Amino acid sequence: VVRTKIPMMNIALSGEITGGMQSGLLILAGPSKSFKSNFGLTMVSSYMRQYPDAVCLFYDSEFGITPAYLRSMGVDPERVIHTPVQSLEQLRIDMVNQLDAIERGEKVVVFIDSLGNLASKMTRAKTMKSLFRIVTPYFSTKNIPCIAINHTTGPMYSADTVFIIGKRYQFVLNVEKSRTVKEKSKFFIDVKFDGGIDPYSGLLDMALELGFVVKPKNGWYAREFLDEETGEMIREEKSWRAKDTNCTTFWGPLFKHQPFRDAIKRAYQLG
Amino acid sequence: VVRTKIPMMNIALSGEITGGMQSGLLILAGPSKSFKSNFGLTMVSSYMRQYPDAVCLFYDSEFGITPAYLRSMGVDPERVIHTPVQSLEQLRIDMVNQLDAIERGEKVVVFIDSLGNLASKTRAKTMKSLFRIVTPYFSTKNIPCIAINHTYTGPMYSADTVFIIGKRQFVLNVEKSRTVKEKSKFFIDVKFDGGIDPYSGLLDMALELGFVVKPKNGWYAREFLDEETGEMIREEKSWRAKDTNCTTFWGPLFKHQPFRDAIKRAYQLGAI
């Protein structure tokens, strides 16, 4: 299990609060300036923190991510193998050579920033499709994740997972394709004006849908917990404003409440 | 006024919880990979947020801070005038030229990434002149300048404000300042996720000032001053450290004038 710091991301990835990223190709797609490559980097960073052992193969065609940017996202640049790329053909040739030099068990995350601005060498959609069909088996055989950014039967159905990200500050992530999560699930991702990626994103809304948080007064919020013995939802005594909920004293008891975790899996996780 | 989201850094800058950056040359110094430029970007970002008006004059000798990096720190790259520099001479030239072109009232923040890798064309003497050359513009035109200087009569005494940043989590030493006592130490944390913690140091400082105590080990309680009895009154509940990084914890303290005052007294130069 490789989970991130954002419980809403873990859900989008695995269907559960306690889940995380899988091996395979994940495409993060959407208009540019929606924080896609930051979400990508959060994932790379989590992988590299879980495995001090790991390296990141970083195929770069944008040149916006530098050592300083990586450090601020908590990625060690010393463990990043940087390959600038100017075409899909070159992307394919270099990925295949490196994926082939890797053994099952080695920790390696692939991050591609970005697919949509690479020339084949018109025939772009075709070449992109066959790049995916060529690299995806390696991801699965060698058991590694690959996160690809793509600024907006199609090529992206050769991927294992597709997130489409849009503007609702506030982002909506739409699960277009997944092995683990119901297609078309919508998750809310907040990015603060300081460019800060809220780890409490979407929790309060979701808990409100799932019943585990209610609203005694307008703009006030209360938790409700299922008592196994009496089959009733028991409110807490206390009432919170929305801003006081972004804290572990608020979320911690719910995250620990199995019914909350189960209501999330049942709402989102596949088969 | 221009405060930031990290109170500890509003205290380092101005000696109080409610203050922030002022006009002048601020140097951020210390070993590279200490989060100086993030720390610097945080201020550039608050300045530009408070003044949707403002432009950033970005003097760049490192090329580590790209448009994307800027956006992720909340600076709009469209409002950034980017100037590559390869020497102090060249940097002096462009700064004087662009500083000169500005009328008072125009909002401008200067960010220099960085100073220590620039050849002159006696490096330290060339540096001191540049400062003595540029700093009158900052005061006249009322603009802040944040300059990064990596460590691998000194010129730094020609700055208005010097922060030395090192690893303790980092410690910020105020080496020179108009507003806070010299040698003040502040704790800045950066979490595993590259997260610039806005609760940096507040716990240590409150423990120092006596507004937080430890009932048992690993537990923390707030104390408030009953200003009529002069007594320090504990709150009912205790909290582990991790429960404290929340507005529900710090908020009633930030509202409590005795806590605000204890902070000025420990950090703000008395004569303000």
- The DSSP letter of residue A247 is S
B105 at interface of A, judged by CB pairs closer than 8 A: no
Cα angle: B248, vertex B253, B254; to 5 degrees: 95
- The CATH architecture that domain A1-271 belongs to is 3-Layer(aba) Sandwich (3.40)
Helices B202-209/B7-14 angle, 10° precision? 60
- Backbone angles phi and psi of A172, in degrees to 5: -105, 125
Distances (CA, A) of B40 to B26, B30, B109, B136, B182: 9, 13, 11, 21, 20
| A245 neighbors A200 (Cβ within 8 angstroms) | yes
Residues belonging to the binding site of B for ATP are: 30-37
Q: How many CA atoms lie within 13 A of A92 on its CB side?
A: 15
What the block records as the tokens of B28 is 């951020």
Residues of A in contact with B63 (CB under 8 A): 66
Please give, rounded to a whole number of angstroms, the shortest distance from the CA of B240 to a CA of chain A. 10
User: Which residues, 6 or more positions from A163, have their beta carbon under 8 angstroms from its beta carbon?
Assistant: A12, A26, A27, A28, A29, A30, A39, A173, A174, A175, A176
Q: How far is CA B207 from the centre of its chain?
A: 22
Structure determined by: X-ray
- A96 C-beta neighbours (distance < 10 Å), count: 14
**Tokens 């945080």 found at:** B42
B45 at interface of A, judged by CB pairs closer than 8 A: yes
Q: How far is CA B101 from the centre of its chain?
A: 27
Question: H/E element holding A69?
Answer: helix A67-72
Which amino acid is residue A65, in one-letter code? Answer: I
CA B264 to CA B272: how far, in whole Å? Answer: 10
Q: After which residues is chain B broken (C to N over 2.5 A)?
A: 121, 152, 168
- Structure's resolution in angstroms: 2.4
Interface of B with A in 59-78 (CB under 8 A): 62-69, 71-74
What the block records as the tokens of B19 is 């203050």
Residues in chain A: 271
Task: Bin A146: left if φ > 0, else alpha if -120 < ψ < 50, else beta.
Answer: beta
User: Which residues, 6 or more positions from A240, have their beta carbon under 8 angstroms from its beta carbon?
Assistant: A220, A221, A222, A250
- The DSSP letter of residue A239 is -
Closest CA to A187 of A255, A268, A106, A128: A268
Closest CA to A40 of A68, A60, A17: A60
Closest CA to A79 of A51, A102, A104, A60: A51
CA A223 to CA A233: how far, in whole Å? Answer: 9
What the block records as the tokens of A230 is 């009496």
- State the Cα torsion B109-B110-B113-B117 to the nearest 10°: -170
Question: H/E element holding A251?
Answer: helix A248-255
CA B198 to CA B9: how far, in whole Å? Answer: 9
Strand partners of residue A226: A233
Closest CA to B86 of B51, B128, B119: B119
CA A37 to CA B68: how far, in whole Å? Answer: 9
- State the Cα torsion B129-B130-B134-B139 to the nearest 10°: -60
- The DSSP letter of residue A86 is S
Residues belonging to the binding site of A for ATP are: 30-37
- The DSSP letter of residue A53 is T
CA B160 to CA B143: how far, in whole Å? Answer: 12
| B185 neighbors B172 (Cβ within 8 angstroms) | yes
3-state secondary structure chain B: CCCCCCHHHHHHHHCCCCCCCCCEEEEEEEECCCCHHHHHHHHHHHHHHHCCCCEEEEEECCCCCCHHHHHHCCCCHHHEEEEECCEHHHHHHHHHHHHHCCCCCCCEEEEEECCCCCECCCHHHHHHHHHHHHHHHHHHCCCEEEEEEEECCCHHHHCCEEEEEEECCEEEEEEECCCECCCCEEEECECCCCCECCCCCHHHHHHHHCCEECCCCCCEEEEEEECCCCEEEECCCCECHHHHCCHHHHHHHHCCHHHHHHHHHHHECCCC
CA A52 to CA A97: how far, in whole Å? Answer: 24
A82 at interface of B, judged by CB pairs closer than 8 A: no
User: Which of A35, A43, A70, A72 would you mutate first to test chain B, the one with the most B CBs within 10 A?
Assistant: A72
DSSP code string of A146-215: EEEEEE---GGGGSSEEEEEEE--EEEEEEEE-SSB-TT-EEEEEB-TTS-B-TTTTHHHHHHHHTSEE-
What the block records as the tokens of B3 is 């405060």
Cα angle: A105, vertex A109, A110; to 5 degrees: 130
What the block records as the tokens of B34 is 């200490």
Distances (CA, A) of B260 to A224, B11, B38, B193: 37, 10, 27, 30
CA A235 to CA A214: how far, in whole Å? Answer: 9
Cα angle: A265, vertex A111, B44; to 5 degrees: 95
| B83 neighbors B144 (Cβ within 8 angstroms) | no
| B150 neighbors B117 (Cβ within 8 angstroms) | yes
What the block records as the tokens of B256 is 């409590």
Q: How many CA atoms lie within 13 A of A179 on its CB side?
A: 12
CA A42 to CA A29: how far, in whole Å? Answer: 16
CATH number for the region B1-272 comes to 3.40.50.300
The number of helices, as runs of H, and strands, as runs of E, in chain A is 8, 12
Interface of A with B in 232-251 (CB under 8 A): 243-244, 246-249
